Amino acid sequence: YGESLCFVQHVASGLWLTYAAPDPKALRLGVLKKKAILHQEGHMDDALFLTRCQQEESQAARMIHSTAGLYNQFIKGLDSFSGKPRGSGPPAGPALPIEAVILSLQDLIGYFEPPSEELQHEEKQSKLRSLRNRQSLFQEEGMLSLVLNCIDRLNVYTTAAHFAEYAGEEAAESWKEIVNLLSELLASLIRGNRANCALFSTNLDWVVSKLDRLEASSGILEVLYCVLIESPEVLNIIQENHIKSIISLLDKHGRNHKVLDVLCSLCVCNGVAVRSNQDLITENLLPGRE
Amino acid sequence: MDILELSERLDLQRFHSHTLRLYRAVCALGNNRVAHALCSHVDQAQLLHALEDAHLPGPLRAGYYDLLISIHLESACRSRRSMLSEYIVPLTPETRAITLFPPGRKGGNARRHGLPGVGVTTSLRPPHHFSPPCFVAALPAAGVAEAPARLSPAIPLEALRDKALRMLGEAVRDGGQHARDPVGGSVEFQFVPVLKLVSTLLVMGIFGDEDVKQILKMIEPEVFTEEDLEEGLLQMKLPESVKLQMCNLLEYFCDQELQHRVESLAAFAERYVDKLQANQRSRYALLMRAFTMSAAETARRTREFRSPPQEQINMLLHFKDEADEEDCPLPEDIRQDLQDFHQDLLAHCGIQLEEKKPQSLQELVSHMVVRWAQEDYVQSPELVRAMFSLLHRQYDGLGELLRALPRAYTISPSSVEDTMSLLECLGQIRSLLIVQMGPQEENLMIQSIGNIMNNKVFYQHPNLMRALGMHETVMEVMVNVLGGGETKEIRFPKMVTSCCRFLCYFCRISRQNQRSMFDHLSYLLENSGIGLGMQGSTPLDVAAASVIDNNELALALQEQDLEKVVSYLAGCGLQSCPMLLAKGYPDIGWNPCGGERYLDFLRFAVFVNGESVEENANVVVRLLIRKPECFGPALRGEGGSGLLAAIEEAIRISEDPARDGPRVHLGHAIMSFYAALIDLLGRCAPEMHLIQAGKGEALRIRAILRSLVPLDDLVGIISLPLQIPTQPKMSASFVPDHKASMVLFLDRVYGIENQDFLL
Amino acid sequence: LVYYEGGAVCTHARSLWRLEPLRISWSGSHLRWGQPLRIRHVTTGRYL
Amino acid sequence: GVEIETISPGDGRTFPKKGQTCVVHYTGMLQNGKKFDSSRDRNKPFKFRIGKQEVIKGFEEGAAQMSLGQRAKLTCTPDVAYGATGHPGVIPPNATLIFDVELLNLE
Amino acid sequence: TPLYNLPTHRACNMFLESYKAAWILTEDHSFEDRMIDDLSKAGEQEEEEKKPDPLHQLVLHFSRTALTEKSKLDEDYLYMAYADIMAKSCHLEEGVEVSFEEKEMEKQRLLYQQSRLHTRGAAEMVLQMISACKGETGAMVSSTLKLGISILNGGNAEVQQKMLDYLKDKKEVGFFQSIQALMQTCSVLDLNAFERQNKAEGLINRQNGEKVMADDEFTQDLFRFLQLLCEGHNNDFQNYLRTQTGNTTTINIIICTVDYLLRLQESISDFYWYYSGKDVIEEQGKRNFSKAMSVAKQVFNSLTEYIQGP
């Protein structure tokens, strides 16, 4: 791996890999997005040397592949009966790998856990950096749109007993656990990641709407609080609808301190006060006594 | 139910320990309107009752104390604290009596410093402008921009200061018994909330003279009482959360000591410079009125009368310390006084070498900080940083005094009110900086800027505004707005022009002000983009005003900044600027208005003062024509059309045709771009044979630019009549003084000897 | 498709490939010259 | 307009004619018994002024129909009041106001 | 009239500037060694894991801020004062008739003064605070480099081992990357910039000779620190600079030193083909020649220390 150069060649065709040298145009704006094409001669300068990736990234890639396959199977199973109100005999055909997906979700939650604060600064920072790197590696190769698709395909059902079981059976006890585990995994993926929170800020309206679910509020509030405290730019994007929805969530779920923490996050930004949010909270929450 | 029941009902205490947080987080960082609204829910009686209550739980005691601080004494303290660094001292008889005062009354001058913080500190500081809270007002309907933003809610200060002293006195008394039941949950909840209120009250200058003495005596009765029982706060064991707060109390006193030092020395100047001015008059009169000594007294008079005032004082003050030679036409009596004053300053400010008790602040705090860290391993990083930030200051007083001098200034009476109305407007701009841009803030910022501009003194003391960060703060405001999400012109316009107007007006008063603003050119040139400066100013307008006439800074320009303008000009001059297309203007692959106003900066950077800087003209010429897609390449001979052919079709489409949209029409703008280009080429031409005859580079550039524009078309352009003098016209095309850009090009390039002198 | 993109994507899982020798039993030997391979992309679980 | 019911007898022949600044002590509570403003907490009289209103006109006429020592329980309707917009964050829109105005007339 | 008719406030302001630049900051501070003296002797007023008073806490406080990534380094004005005070704790007290007895007193005093800091982890702080710069050429790395010279002045065989052990323990990359980047940003002698100064001087209003090179103190200090690293024929550290085994990347600082010397040689040779025709060297040209040659000597000495101890 120490600057040992080599060439790659097909055995049957006998061709070699060089630059394709395509037509140069500013359509895709590809700085180096050129297709690799087996060519006869090319420019005789396409020798590549080898470097070895580390065990951490190799494991991350392997779990990425396995989890992607499992999630694809799960979403296929979910969409199989999307428009099939069978009624009598709710289950038919292939069965959802509920146990496997539960175990995978638990293992991934344990994998992406924040380091304990009872360690010295050097190892604390090292573990934090490793966690951030692994979270970014998972985020880049999807795994955020995947869990978003999983959760928004699951949440098409609300009653969780009968209208969620009109298209399935034996999964009644595997509904709440799946939803909670998905919410926890979503929270842990973006917990303390500036880039991940910035990327996830696109569906802030969806996250706000998910608050009044009565089944996933515990995880949804945590996700909203984390994104608010890690990406202090969606405060301007916050409208009156979000504030009213959060206040209604507080009124629906009773007295709580996490709601007040979320409102405090919706208050002044990273060193800059947001008078719009301040006045919205003042004129909504507490002219409205009792 | 009784609020004290929350000491057991932990389910509701946690919610109420966070509701108070939301109360003081919804009105934080200004927002004095909400702070008035909160006065209807938590009135004065509840806050005052909770201040002295001893049965309240731990978290709720700290929550109520900070709620009162963040409602009544937050906006009025942040403004005072931020501006407190700058020192402005008037020259009044009250200030005259102020001296450094190493106390020589009833004892030697090397006595106790004398309870710092009780002096006659007379720096200019506006009041707090409190407003009484009422809820039966009319609440008139007014616009957001025209709204006179509310002040902080009022509260009796005399009651608050007397109360706050009482709790601190009781707390330091009850702490000596070491009882097993503190006021709050522990000793941390008993000493911290009261200490925060005292620290907040101190920086606003609310405590009187005897009130500070009580604070100093209670803090330490061994070194601060001038004329274990009653032990100070420095003796008994305290946790880190309490050690942090006492580091802020001692920080204020050190600032008080420093403010006393700088004000005293500035007041000493009027006592010393008055003697020097009188002595200088006598010295000059004796040397000049008595000319019988010799007829060659110019040697002894040029160095004392034909020199700038800076050289006069510097040479005079160079005496009394120049290796026992003293090299001056200055007497011996006043020389001793200055040396005596210097020794007085040194003794008071640190160095005094020329189980002992401290006897002064500079040794008490130094030993305490050393004692604190050696007793135990400090865990909280904030205390560790604060401890050394206070220890280092006390171990080096000269450095802090030296650093405070650039912000120190002196002002004569009858103009304090002029300065008074400037500091208040400056504070409004500083306060609005931590607030998101809004129509209310934008209107308020403009009003403050307008008052600042022509107040009384923006022209009288330019050097005062060189310090104090006057220009930097306004620039920082511009930077925040100009950032945007890839676009900022739509983001709150009509305010960037005013801030740019302030900067342009800031550069026209002094060269040093212009010199300081020139340092911010990389960012300034980078954001010289869309423009749209139909009124006011542009981001490039201030950049041009920084190099309008320097002859020293124009030579200091780099190569990237000049190459950026032409590269930006090339892109500007190749498109139609679709902003013009919004009005229905015809589409042409060249910007007439954008290009004309873009190279005007280069016209100022290459023509310094009546000359052509050869260090930049050669660079400008190369990059100007390096890219063929410049100087209007469509009809400038580059594309094959010709410069002479550019003005032909331009006239036919300018003399009032109905082939364009509605004062930004494709008229004068079409032909002004080339006129400015001709002028810009004329400015960079070699001056005369001083470089042309001697060097061959001057003629080489002259030949290159001569080939760009042949003389065959200059005669045609100048021969074209301007317009009918009588009926009149407007800024449409071919203005009467347009025969100036071509004329100067002819003078500086071709000239006339005998051939063209006839036709 | 196989691209030649680089720069900031040099520290991600896309550029990760593993060598699969046809020697099923002793697959752990050093990659000798001219040894045939079944180069595999792990993230998508595919073979070049 | 407003209700001028009394709580204390007081004295009658001390009506405010015009111009003079009258001194009142007011406690203001909303409906349902909720209280929002009370000058007794601050121990400072409002120092009411006539003509230049700067106040609620309903409160103005309620205080005008009063004399020395005559505590009045005002029932200001939400018409001569803060109006359909109300005081933001304190007084919700479209609500009657209950006042406990006691005039001391320190002038 | 500079003599009279000036307003008193304007006259007072003129006195403030003259007094500040003439009478203040003249010679008398001498508080650097007094600080560290009482800062360490008071470790236990009345009495293991308890660190020295700030010495193993203040240093650890700065070390902690050097480990928080933040993707940048703050101004940290507090670090400016202390990293200079600790640097002057040995530099200010740097130990034709110098006898042997006084020579040993000077040498032993310096060793004890450096042992006052390097035993508290000051050596580790220098390596961390110079890695966090990541090639930044601001005032953050100027103070750290100056401290790294005083704590290593004379080639301490103890501090060199502590620095080498720490580098081979973490096996992290970035200390050499910042070092390599700092070498590339070093300036050389310039001619067109010098030409601009001549016109400006012909007529404040000048750079006071800080326009041609202006990288004088930093360039020498960067190479002086490198030379002082492998000074006493340290074979272990000489190999580390050329190639690091535990690290995943090799930077070869020795080759980087040659590269900067090549640019400086070309710069001075081009400067030579400016005064070749003229037989008189101007005063401004003399200073520029001295500035470049003095830096060139420091580069040459650093290259020698890489080879001595063959």
Substitution target from B29, B384, B441 for chain A, most A beta carbons within 10 A? B29
Round to whole Å and give the CA distance between B73 and B173: 27
In our burial notation (b when 16+ CB lie closer than 10 A, e otherwise), range B663-700 reads ebbbbbbbbbbbbbbbbbbbbbbbeeeebbeeeeebee
Contacts of E303 (CB under 8 A, 6+ apart): E254, E257, E258, E261
- Stretch (H or E) spanning B394: helix B381-395
Q: How many beta carbons lie within 10 A of that of residue E217, not counting itself? A: 11
- Stretch (H or E) spanning E109: helix E100-118
Substitution target from A125, A128, A136 for chain E, most E beta carbons within 10 A? A125
User: Which residue, among B382, B532, B537, B529, has the nearest Cα to B474 in the 3D structure?
Assistant: B537
Round to whole Å and give the CA distance between E116 and E119: 6
Distance from the Cα of C2 to chain A's closest Cα (Å) equals: 6
Round to whole Å and give the CA distance between D44 and D36: 16
- Burial of residue B464 (CB within 10 Å: 0-12, 13-18, 19+) is buried
In one-letter notation, the amino acid at residue B395 is: Y
Contacts of B129 (CB under 8 A, 6+ apart): B76, B151, B152
Angle subtended by helix axes B44-52 and B157-174, to nearest 10: 20
Domains of chain D with bracketed CATH: 1-107 (3.10.50.40)
A275/D contact by beta carbon, under 8 A: no
The answer to whether the Cβ–Cβ distance between D89 and A287 falls below 8 Å is yes
User: Which residue, among B596, B733, B744, has the nearest Cα to B677 in the 3D structure?
Assistant: B596
Residues of D forming the active site? 26, 36-37, 56, 82, 99
CB D46 within 8 A of CB D26: yes
Round to whole Å and give the CA distance between B24 and A170: 51
Sequence-distant contacts of E69-73: CB under 8 A, at least 24 apart: E69/A125, E69/A129, E73/E132, E73/E133, E73/E136, E73/E138, E73/E140
Determine if residue E5 is left, alpha or beta; phi over 0 gives left, psi from -120 to 50 gives alpha, anything else beta. Answer: left
The encoded tokens of residue C22 equal 């046809």
The resolution in Å comes to 3.3
Q: In this complex, how many residue pairs, one in chain A and one in chain D, have their CB atoms less than 8 Å apart?
A: 15
**Closest Cα in chain C to A19:** C4
Q: Which of A260, A272, A279 comes nearest B18 by C-beta?
A: A260
- Burial of residue E278 (CB within 10 Å: 0-12, 13-18, 19+) is exposed
CB D36 within 8 A of CB D30: yes
Q: Following DSSP, what letter does each residue of E165-199 receive, concatenated?
A: HHHHHH--SSHHHHHHHHHHT-----SHHHHHHHH
The encoded tokens of residue C37 equal 């391979």
Task: Answer positive or negative: Cα dihedral of B121, B123, B124, B129.
Answer: negative
Residue D82 with chain B: CB contacts under 8 Å: 139
The encoded tokens of residue A261 equal 């923490």
Q: Following DSSP, what letter does each residue of B161-174 receive, concatenated?
A: HHHHHHHHHHHHHH
Q: How far is CA A288 from CA A84, B28, B41, in A?
A: 46, 21, 12
DSSP annotation of B460: T
User: Which residue, among A257, D28, D58, D22, has the nearest Cα to B39 in the 3D structure?
Assistant: D28
Alpha helices in chain D (DSSP H): 39-42, 57-64
The answer to whether the Cβ–Cβ distance between A282 and D34 falls below 8 Å is no
The answer to whether the Cβ–Cβ distance between D86 and A287 falls below 8 Å is yes
**Closest Cα in chain D to B134:** D37
Q: Following DSSP, what letter does each residue of B528-583 receive, concatenated?
A: --S---SSS--HHHHHHHTSSS-SSSSTT--SHHHHHHHHHHHHHTTS--HHHHTT
User: Which residue, among E171, E131, E126, has the nearest Cα to E153 in the 3D structure?
Assistant: E126
Round to whole Å and give the CA distance between B579 and B270: 60
